[PDB]
Amino acid sequence: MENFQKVEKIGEGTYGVVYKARNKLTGEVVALKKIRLVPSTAIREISLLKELNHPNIVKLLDVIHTENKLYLVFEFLHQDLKKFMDASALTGIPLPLIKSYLFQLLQGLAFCHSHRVLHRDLKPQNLLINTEGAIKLADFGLARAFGVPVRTYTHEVVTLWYRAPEILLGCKYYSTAVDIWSLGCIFAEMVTRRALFPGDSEIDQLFRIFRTLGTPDEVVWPGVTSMPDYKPSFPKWARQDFSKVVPPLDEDGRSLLSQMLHYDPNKRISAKAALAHPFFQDVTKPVPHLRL
Template identity: 65%
Template sequence: MEQYEKVEKIGEGTYGVVYKGKHRHTNETIALKKIRLEQEDEGVPSTAIREISLLKEMQHRNIVRLQDVVHKEKCIYLVFEYLDLDLKKHMDSSPDFKNHRIVKSFLYQILRGIAYCHSHRVLHRDLKPQNLLIDRRTNSLKLADFGLARAFGIPVRTFTHEVVTLWYRAPEILLGARHYSTPVDMWSVGCIFAEMVNQKPLFPGDSEIDELFKIFSIMGTPNEETWPGVASLPDYISTFPKWPSVDLATVVPTLDSSGLDLLSKMLRLDPSKRINARAALEHEYFKDLEVA
């Protein structure tokens, strides 16, 4: 850690404290994430070190760059490029989102980052507005924390005992699926898309069952016909209330028809029917976007 200096604490992430820091030799501002590990006594698992080392290879303009990994006895510091604004803070403070061009540009950049990660077989699993970072000077957006869930797991609570949000979690995960893949991230993107347009979360559940019911009451309760295999997922219960699906145009009323079409393809309950990131980038919703 000698080459890095902590400047100030800037937040508490899922895994540990986040500091603003600087590189002693170059003076470059960086973000330092201290990863606290569950088994404090055992040190850092080698699997986690391997996973994280692979992430240094990931280089894309829509991904927050992992510059370095510093291994101390009981913890790991991850050194990232520094961005001071996230999408949640930006949505809370900026009138920009009345402008659908900004929403479209941000959504496109999210998808571009995800398509890159998925093409490298890396999932995020915990996408939310708080880990989408924005560079105010250029209005460019970058995904943070990609690949960390696989290295460290997703805790139920953060190390400060805050509950990790369920609002963006895919239904297959909520239903206890052990094997899931890239569609879980596309579900999260759909939730974030709707939230950018509506300026409020789409499925703000406060427990796993409440989250499922919020999803089903809009998307319809799934069954073997609409989602083959759903009944054999560990946490599926045949006595779930049977909600019909609601027209998404009533849920996201200011979104145009091509936007609604794309959103509905991201929010398919059956993950095998969900659109993938590459196909989403080609969707007609983006045809009038000037791509930078």
């Protein structure tokens, strides 16, 4: 902590505050996260994260466990996907770049999934971009370490918008499919320039998903009716056309999203399978127009 000079606050997560900071010795510019809470298992989970290195995962440079406090020192990235979407709002992010970004996030996901590590809380604000055309996942594995509360330390309400329905229906065992779901939500938002399911309570979130995708039943999702928060009294809505949901996404794009948004997590496409989907046949890596 005293080895770093704070430059500016750049965010507030479910785990505490994030600063751009500079390392007083080496000169390195990092993202410094002080974790609010250190339990011996948090230490051990977090230390596993230090080995989980990939070009599409924000590098955890150091864990500083000092004075009974916990700091995470990350590779610094200058912008998030929310800010970039908002800045690209008038014409949309070009599809070639959407495709490149979706392709890289799926590589990062396939990587972490293959090491049995989930994100659990993907969202535009933890997807980070550079001037080189890269996109990276931030805070991977942190939710399994400190817990996703309803409010942050500053009382900010956590988004439900990207939450998978198995989580909303109270499944205690998350699988990697929850990340695919969130990433599918983000894909749709990139394309349409609107959030797919902007719920403002758990039942609002659920009911927005049902209105678009049809209330789930035993046909499409064996087991759904026996989940902890499933209620027979849930209204039964019919599905909508994806054609109606993400114009002007093309047929390959629509077919992948549909597989990323399958109700049953066991039918939901894997990151590795989605990488082989025809939508990526012509993937490229454009450089974005970034104002920093």
